[PDB]
Write a protein that binds this DNA or RNA. Structure first.
Ligand SMILES: Nc1ncnc2c1ncn2[C@@H]1O[C@H](COP(=O)(O)OP(=O)(O)OP(=O)(O)O)[C@@H](O)[C@H]1O
Ligand SMILES: N[C@H](CO)CCC(=O)O
Ligand SMILES: [Mg+2]
Ligand SMILES: [Mg+2]
Length: 468
RNA sequence: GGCCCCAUCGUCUAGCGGUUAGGACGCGGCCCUCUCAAGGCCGAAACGGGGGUUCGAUUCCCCCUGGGGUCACCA
């Protein structure tokens, strides 16, 4: 069948590049009723960030993806954390030695740097070490690494399913280290070994790994194993077209969640990075994407991640995809974080409905509608101005208000339209100053609904401090 | 620089020899309207250059240019 995987390295915040690549592996596996695996690639203790693993795993779930095998879901080919598979790579690196496909190299990092300077890149000098001598030096405990012994001279063919075949000259492929002197494997060794043993048949990964594939094809040959299909996804870019990075763009999935972006929208946006629906539709579900996916509709240019379009899309989801109640629920954590509370679900729902078309992120809701949940709201200079200018006619409306029994949006509008008429003045001239009295702002939803919302007593109580 | 990949509006893109080169974000205008939004409508905006192949290139081939990626005891 079809087995795909995402192999995140726990060395920093959950990366948007990770979600993007994971998204396509998940779809390609589901499209073929296959398996989507999660393998944690923690082979470098130096860059290892404790707690990054749980974070990436939670972020993939948050985004909506589900995996069939992995660290916290089990599976027949675990462990799914490379740090727990060390004896394995060890066993295979040694197998390469016996097959004459690898060799031990004892140079210190300092000599290597010197060799890199003198000849630019390791020159494979350790190949001239007699195997028996290498062995003895290893048995004595002499620190060393195991390197890939590239067949020189020669040529190596790599086949990308989206680009075609690429023929490499073996002189462009280095005798890369497979096993480090601390006993850990390098990405090259572990990736091929683990993909084989886990049964992956479809490697979908970012284009940044394209040139490293020949190294992988050689390893698969060395082991006498069948290579999987390779599909390299174009890299996500910063506005300047360079591979998206932490300083030129927001790459942290935690930032997006913190900013109030809906996972559903972020996911939908990610789908448009390199792919497009047959009919041209832009808003669609994860499940629809899975079902319409095809490599034929994947474009290879490096897509610039447009934060602006994402906000737009996020707003689009909030008002057209999620239900009112779903939006009301998602907005709570942000209200809590803002230190605000709501009277009841009923109140909250109504508040969210009024503001629905006016915020593009969940975080903006407590900011633009703060006056709806606390008296501790700011008053803009322009609002304070409109209020002062309208104080006279507001004083004359107050009594009519406290006299109004039917406190409804229909009645209220009728009461005000009349007041503006009987006063020979445009509605806005009365509406705007009142709006500033109730909201401390001149940018809000409709006055009647805003007026109704709080109820007669509450409204007048606020209108009073403004006239006081 | 060597090697590799890529190339349609500013950005994400549709196109798979013949189209007024379409959509989306953003931008500008109009309508709606009690503000601000949302929404509707209109508009400005692209095939990097040069050769070919061909009756006919955005589309197929080649060169170059440009952009990106990679060349670690990191992934
Ligand atoms: N900027 C990016 N754009 C697109 N895909 C990316 C990007 N960065 C990583 N990926 C891909 O997403 C997956 C995430 O792998 P990983 O968690 O190790 O992220 P990473 O950025 O490569 O981390 P590291 O710093 O250790 O190299 C891989 O399949 C990788 O190819
Ligand atoms: N550990 C690597 C994370 O980038 C795996 C990349 C891949 O081969 O798909
Ligand atoms: Mg473009
Ligand atoms: Mg046009």
């Amino acid at each position: 069948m079809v087995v795909t995987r995402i192999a995140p390295s726990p060395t920093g915040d959950p990366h948007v590049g990770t979600a993007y690549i994971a998204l396509f592996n998940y779809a390609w596996a589901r499209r073929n009723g296959g398996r989507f695996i999660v393998r944690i690639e923690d082979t470098d203790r130096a860059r290892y960030v404790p707690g990054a693993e749980e974070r990436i795993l939670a972020a993939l779930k948050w985004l909506g993806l589900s995996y069939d095998e992995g660290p916290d879901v089990g599976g027949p080919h675990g462990p799914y954390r490379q740090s727990e598979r060390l004896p394995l790579y060890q066993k295979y690196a040694e197998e390469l030695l016996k097959r004459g496909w690898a060799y031990r190299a004892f140079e210190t990092p300092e000599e290597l740097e010197q060799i890199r300077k003198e000849k630019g890149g390791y020159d494979g000098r350790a190949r001239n070490i007699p195997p028996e001598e290498a062995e003895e030096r290893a048995r004595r405990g002499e620190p060393h690494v195991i390197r890939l012994k590239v067949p020189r001279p020669g040529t190596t063919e790599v086949k990308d399913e989206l680009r075609g075949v690429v023929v490499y000259d073996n002189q462009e492929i280095p005798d890369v280290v497979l096993l480090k002197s601390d006993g850990y494997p390098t990405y090259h060794l572990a990736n091929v070994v683990d993909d084989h043993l886990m049964g992956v048949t479809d490697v979908i990964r970012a284009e940044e790994w394209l040139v490293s594939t020949p190294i992988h094809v050689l390893l698969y040959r060395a082991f006498g194993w069948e290579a999987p299909r390779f599909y390299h996804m174009p890299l996500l870019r910063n506005p300047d077209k360079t591979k998206i990075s932490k300083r030129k763009s927001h790459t942290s999935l935690d930032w997006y969640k913190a900013e109030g972006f809906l996972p559903e929208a972020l996911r939908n946006y990610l789908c448009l990075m390199g792919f497009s629906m047959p009919d041209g539709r832009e808003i669609f579900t994860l499940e629809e994407f899975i079902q319409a996916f095809t490599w034929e509709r994947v474009s290879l240019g490096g897509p610039v991640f447009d934060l602006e379009k994402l906000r737009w899309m996020n707003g689009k989801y909030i008002r057209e995809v999620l239900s009112l109640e779903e939006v009301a629920e998602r907005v709570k954590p942000f209200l809590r974080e803002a230190g605000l509370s709501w009277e009841s679900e009923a109140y909250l729902r109504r508040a969210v409905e009024l503001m629905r078309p006016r915020f593009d992120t969940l975080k903006e809701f407590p900011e633009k509608a703060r006056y709806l949940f606390t008296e501790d709201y700011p008053v803009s200079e322009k609002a304070q101005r409109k209020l002062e200018e309208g104080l006279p006619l507001l004083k004359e409306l107050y009594p009519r208000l406290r006299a109004q029994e039917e406190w409804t949006e229909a009645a209220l509008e009728a009461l005000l339209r009349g007041f503006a008429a009987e006063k020979g003045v445009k509605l806005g001239q009365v509406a705007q100053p009142l709006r500033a009295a109730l909201t401390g702002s001149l940018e809000t939803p409709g006055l009647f609904e805003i007026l109704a919302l709080l109820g007669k007593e509450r409204a007048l109580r606020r209108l009073e401090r403004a006239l006081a």
